Each structure stands twice: as C-alpha cells, then as structure tokens.
C-alpha cells in the first residue's frame, strides 16, 4: 500500500507514534517519506547482506527475521514480511523499540540527513488531525 501523506499521519497518530520519545508526528511522517516514499512494500538490500523493510525501512540485521541474514538478531520478534503489510501496526510497534534504544531517531539515516533540523511540521500541515 502507498499511503497518502495525511492518511499516514492519521494512522501513525492513532497508533500513538505522535510525540513518542519526544518526536512530533512531523518527524515520523518525514522519516517515512524519505525512507520509503510512503510505500509499505518497500525493500532495500544493505551492503552487509541485511535488508531494510517497509514504511520505516527496519533492518533485518537487528529487528526482524527474514531467514537470510546469517548472525542477525530479531529484537521485535517478527517476520520481516510483517513489516510490509498494508496495516502499519507491526512497523509502528517495532519503530517504538528502535527509537527507545538510546540513539533516538538517528537510527534512521534518512531522518538524520533529510529531516533533522528542518521544518518537519510542514509534513502534517493541512491535515485534519
Ligand atoms: Cl510536527
Ligand atoms: Cl536470518
Ligand atoms: Cl535471497
Ligand atoms: Cl494502518
Ligand atoms: Cl532522543
Ligand atoms: Na534478523
């Protein structure tokens, strides 16, 4: 599923991601825009052999099991394919664990490079929230 901007903002808010660990909704919508272009089915292979999955490009190196990242962990205790569903529940719950692990949203390199320090509120402007 490819979300619309306001549609994703509404879903993220409903799942309690807005202001989670101090990060406003705009930060999460911005991260998703540049990680996946709002596409739940997004996948990308990393140089080390792991793969990033879903709307927030969660890495099989640490967080999910895809059966093909030898030596990796599964800290969210989910198949990586669950991160590709049209329902973003699994992605949100995993993202909450990632952003809680000490480095905040810096875990998402696209957020650090393209969202951090910018007018992130622009990403939710105009939406009926
Ligand atoms: Cl915001
Ligand atoms: Cl594996
Ligand atoms: Cl393969
Ligand atoms: Cl959803
Ligand atoms: Cl933080
Ligand atoms: Na894994």
PDB file of C-alpha atoms and ligand atoms in Angstrom:
ATOM      1  CA  UNK A   1       0.000   0.000   0.000  1.00  0.00           C
ATOM      2  CA  UNK A   2       1.148   3.521  -0.830  1.00  0.00           C
ATOM      3  CA  UNK A   3      -0.168   5.929   1.809  1.00  0.00           C
ATOM      4  CA  UNK A   4      -1.163   9.500   1.256  1.00  0.00           C
ATOM      5  CA  UNK A   5       0.641  11.987   3.491  1.00  0.00           C
ATOM      6  CA  UNK A   6      -2.330  12.884   5.730  1.00  0.00           C
ATOM      7  CA  UNK A   7      -3.544   9.279   5.659  1.00  0.00           C
ATOM      8  CA  UNK A   8      -0.217   8.083   7.097  1.00  0.00           C
ATOM      9  CA  UNK A   9      -0.159  10.929   9.623  1.00  0.00           C
ATOM     10  CA  UNK A  10      -3.566   9.859  10.858  1.00  0.00           C
ATOM     11  CA  UNK A  11      -2.564   6.186  11.122  1.00  0.00           C
ATOM     12  CA  UNK A  12       0.690   6.979  12.953  1.00  0.00           C
ATOM     13  CA  UNK A  13      -1.147   9.224  15.417  1.00  0.00           C
ATOM     14  CA  UNK A  14      -3.812   6.574  16.022  1.00  0.00           C
ATOM     15  CA  UNK A  15      -1.094   4.041  16.866  1.00  0.00           C
ATOM     16  CA  UNK A  16       0.427   6.511  19.350  1.00  0.00           C
ATOM     17  CA  UNK A  17       3.573   7.409  17.437  1.00  0.00           C
ATOM     18  CA  UNK A  18       2.999  11.180  17.647  1.00  0.00           C
ATOM     19  CA  UNK A  19       5.328  12.661  20.307  1.00  0.00           C
ATOM     20  CA  UNK A  20       6.712   9.203  21.092  1.00  0.00           C
ATOM     21  CA  UNK A  21      10.077   9.553  22.817  1.00  0.00           C
ATOM     22  CA  UNK A  22       9.655  13.296  22.231  1.00  0.00           C
ATOM     23  CA  UNK A  23       9.440  13.120  18.424  1.00  0.00           C
ATOM     24  CA  UNK A  24       6.485  15.048  16.949  1.00  0.00           C
ATOM     25  CA  UNK A  25       4.294  13.497  14.266  1.00  0.00           C
ATOM     26  CA  UNK A  26       6.004  15.547  11.541  1.00  0.00           C
ATOM     27  CA  UNK A  27       9.317  13.814  12.280  1.00  0.00           C
ATOM     28  CA  UNK A  28       7.780  10.393  11.683  1.00  0.00           C
ATOM     29  CA  UNK A  29       5.971  11.407   8.517  1.00  0.00           C
ATOM     30  CA  UNK A  30       9.203  12.979   7.190  1.00  0.00           C
ATOM     31  CA  UNK A  31      11.179   9.822   8.009  1.00  0.00           C
ATOM     32  CA  UNK A  32       8.654   7.649   6.157  1.00  0.00           C
ATOM     33  CA  UNK A  33       8.631   9.958   3.122  1.00  0.00           C
ATOM     34  CA  UNK A  34      12.350   9.644   2.580  1.00  0.00           C
ATOM     35  CA  UNK A  35      12.796   6.046   3.799  1.00  0.00           C
ATOM     36  CA  UNK A  36      10.001   4.506   1.696  1.00  0.00           C
ATOM     37  CA  UNK A  37       8.121   7.242  -0.216  1.00  0.00           C
ATOM     38  CA  UNK A  38       5.155   6.146   1.964  1.00  0.00           C
ATOM     39  CA  UNK A  39       5.168   2.644   0.431  1.00  0.00           C
ATOM     40  CA  UNK A  40       4.604  -0.245   2.852  1.00  0.00           C
ATOM     41  CA  UNK A  41       6.092  -2.747   0.376  1.00  0.00           C
ATOM     42  CA  UNK A  42       9.489  -1.044   0.122  1.00  0.00           C
ATOM     43  CA  UNK A  43      12.604  -3.240   0.480  1.00  0.00           C
ATOM     44  CA  UNK A  44      16.313  -2.409   0.109  1.00  0.00           C
ATOM     45  CA  UNK A  45      19.408  -4.605   0.393  1.00  0.00           C
ATOM     46  CA  UNK A  46      22.226  -3.293   2.587  1.00  0.00           C
ATOM     47  CA  UNK A  47      25.923  -3.757   1.721  1.00  0.00           C
ATOM     48  CA  UNK A  48      26.375  -6.253   4.582  1.00  0.00           C
ATOM     49  CA  UNK A  49      23.628  -8.579   3.330  1.00  0.00           C
ATOM     50  CA  UNK A  50      20.837  -7.454   5.637  1.00  0.00           C
ATOM     51  CA  UNK A  51      17.661  -5.900   4.216  1.00  0.00           C
ATOM     52  CA  UNK A  52      15.503  -2.907   5.199  1.00  0.00           C
ATOM     53  CA  UNK A  53      11.724  -3.434   5.217  1.00  0.00           C
ATOM     54  CA  UNK A  54       8.579  -1.332   4.992  1.00  0.00           C
ATOM     55  CA  UNK A  55       7.391   2.218   5.575  1.00  0.00           C
ATOM     56  CA  UNK A  56      10.221   2.958   8.020  1.00  0.00           C
ATOM     57  CA  UNK A  57      12.842   0.632   6.475  1.00  0.00           C
ATOM     58  CA  UNK A  58      13.520  -1.504   9.544  1.00  0.00           C
ATOM     59  CA  UNK A  59      16.748  -3.537   9.324  1.00  0.00           C
ATOM     60  CA  UNK A  60      16.866  -7.358   9.494  1.00  0.00           C
ATOM     61  CA  UNK A  61      20.367  -7.039  10.971  1.00  0.00           C
ATOM     62  CA  UNK A  62      18.762  -6.339  14.363  1.00  0.00           C
ATOM     63  CA  UNK A  63      14.996  -6.122  14.432  1.00  0.00           C
ATOM     64  CA  UNK A  64      13.200  -8.768  12.336  1.00  0.00           C
ATOM     65  CA  UNK A  65      13.763 -12.212  10.855  1.00  0.00           C
ATOM     66  CA  UNK A  66      13.974 -12.710   7.090  1.00  0.00           C
ATOM     67  CA  UNK A  67      15.854 -16.019   7.192  1.00  0.00           C
ATOM     68  CA  UNK A  68      18.736 -14.732   5.090  1.00  0.00           C
ATOM     69  CA  UNK A  69      20.816 -12.501   7.360  1.00  0.00           C
ATOM     70  CA  UNK A  70      23.222 -15.019   8.987  1.00  0.00           C
ATOM     71  CA  UNK A  71      24.188 -13.962  12.505  1.00  0.00           C
ATOM     72  CA  UNK A  72      21.457 -11.317  12.885  1.00  0.00           C
ATOM     73  CA  UNK A  73      19.034 -10.658  15.721  1.00  0.00           C
ATOM     74  CA  UNK A  74      15.218 -10.461  15.813  1.00  0.00           C
ATOM     75  CA  UNK A  75      14.585  -7.930  18.592  1.00  0.00           C
ATOM     76  CA  UNK A  76      10.992  -7.082  17.571  1.00  0.00           C
ATOM     77  CA  UNK A  77      10.217 -10.818  17.364  1.00  0.00           C
ATOM     78  CA  UNK A  78       8.509 -10.655  13.956  1.00  0.00           C
ATOM     79  CA  UNK A  79       8.986 -11.924  10.419  1.00  0.00           C
ATOM     80  CA  UNK A  80      10.312  -9.099   8.262  1.00  0.00           C
ATOM     81  CA  UNK A  81       7.358  -9.658   5.900  1.00  0.00           C
ATOM     82  CA  UNK A  82       5.013  -8.416   8.661  1.00  0.00           C
ATOM     83  CA  UNK A  83       6.673  -5.042   8.129  1.00  0.00           C
ATOM     84  CA  UNK A  84       5.343  -4.954   4.546  1.00  0.00           C
ATOM     85  CA  UNK A  85       1.618  -5.189   5.338  1.00  0.00           C
ATOM     86  CA  UNK A  86      -0.916  -2.504   4.450  1.00  0.00           C
ATOM     87  CA  UNK A  87      -1.624  -2.350   8.213  1.00  0.00           C
ATOM     88  CA  UNK A  88       1.235  -0.403   9.804  1.00  0.00           C
ATOM     89  CA  UNK A  89       0.763  -1.782  13.328  1.00  0.00           C
ATOM     90  CA  UNK A  90       3.867  -4.036  13.233  1.00  0.00           C
ATOM     91  CA  UNK A  91       6.033  -1.262  11.785  1.00  0.00           C
ATOM     92  CA  UNK A  92       4.904   1.236  14.435  1.00  0.00           C
ATOM     93  CA  UNK A  93       5.446  -1.168  17.336  1.00  0.00           C
ATOM     94  CA  UNK A  94       8.938  -2.034  16.105  1.00  0.00           C
ATOM     95  CA  UNK A  95       9.800   1.656  15.480  1.00  0.00           C
ATOM     96  CA  UNK A  96       8.890   2.382  19.109  1.00  0.00           C
ATOM     97  CA  UNK A  97      11.502  -0.124  20.250  1.00  0.00           C
ATOM     98  CA  UNK A  98      14.152   1.215  17.851  1.00  0.00           C
ATOM     99  CA  UNK A  99      13.711   4.857  18.856  1.00  0.00           C
ATOM    100  CA  UNK A 100      13.935   3.765  22.508  1.00  0.00           C
ATOM    101  CA  UNK A 101      17.337   2.098  22.257  1.00  0.00           C
ATOM    102  CA  UNK A 102      19.426   5.176  23.061  1.00  0.00           C
ATOM    103  CA  UNK A 103      20.095   6.929  19.755  1.00  0.00           C
ATOM    104  CA  UNK A 104      16.575   8.263  19.154  1.00  0.00           C
ATOM    105  CA  UNK A 105      15.643   8.867  15.520  1.00  0.00           C
ATOM    106  CA  UNK A 106      19.298   8.955  14.473  1.00  0.00           C
ATOM    107  CA  UNK A 107      18.791   5.225  13.845  1.00  0.00           C
ATOM    108  CA  UNK A 108      17.140   6.322  10.574  1.00  0.00           C
ATOM    109  CA  UNK A 109      19.890   7.767   8.400  1.00  0.00           C
ATOM    110  CA  UNK A 110      17.373   9.430   6.040  1.00  0.00           C
ATOM    111  CA  UNK A 111      15.824  11.214   9.016  1.00  0.00           C
ATOM    112  CA  UNK A 112      19.225  12.463  10.214  1.00  0.00           C
ATOM    113  CA  UNK A 113      20.202  13.667   6.746  1.00  0.00           C
ATOM    114  CA  UNK A 114      16.912  14.975   5.383  1.00  0.00           C
ATOM    115  CA  UNK A 115      14.543  15.694   8.306  1.00  0.00           C
ATOM    116  CA  UNK A 116      16.566  16.520  11.420  1.00  0.00           C
ATOM    117  CA  UNK A 117      16.816  20.282  11.934  1.00  0.00           C
ATOM    118  CA  UNK A 118      14.266  21.094   9.245  1.00  0.00           C
ATOM    119  CA  UNK A 119      10.681  22.383   9.376  1.00  0.00           C
ATOM    120  CA  UNK A 120       9.188  18.933   9.943  1.00  0.00           C
ATOM    121  CA  UNK A 121       5.752  20.338  10.892  1.00  0.00           C
ATOM    122  CA  UNK A 122       5.316  21.035   7.165  1.00  0.00           C
ATOM    123  CA  UNK A 123       4.715  17.305   6.664  1.00  0.00           C
ATOM    124  CA  UNK A 124       1.451  17.376   8.641  1.00  0.00           C
ATOM    125  CA  UNK A 125       0.287  20.852   7.610  1.00  0.00           C
ATOM    126  CA  UNK A 126      -3.244  20.965   6.195  1.00  0.00           C
ATOM    127  CA  UNK A 127      -4.207  17.566   7.620  1.00  0.00           C
ATOM    128  CA  UNK A 128      -7.337  17.159   9.727  1.00  0.00           C
ATOM    129  CA  UNK A 129      -5.740  15.954  12.908  1.00  0.00           C
TER     130      UNK A 129
HETATM  131 CL1  LIG B   1       5.389  18.118  13.750  1.00  0.00          CL
HETATM  132 CL1  LIG B   2      18.480 -14.741   9.352  1.00  0.00          CL
HETATM  133 CL1  LIG B   3      17.813 -14.444  -1.149  1.00  0.00          CL
HETATM  134 CL1  LIG B   4      -2.819   1.221   9.467  1.00  0.00          CL
HETATM  135 CL1  LIG B   5      16.100  11.483  21.680  1.00  0.00          CL
HETATM  136 NA1  LIG B   6      17.380 -10.825  11.696  1.00  0.00          NA
END
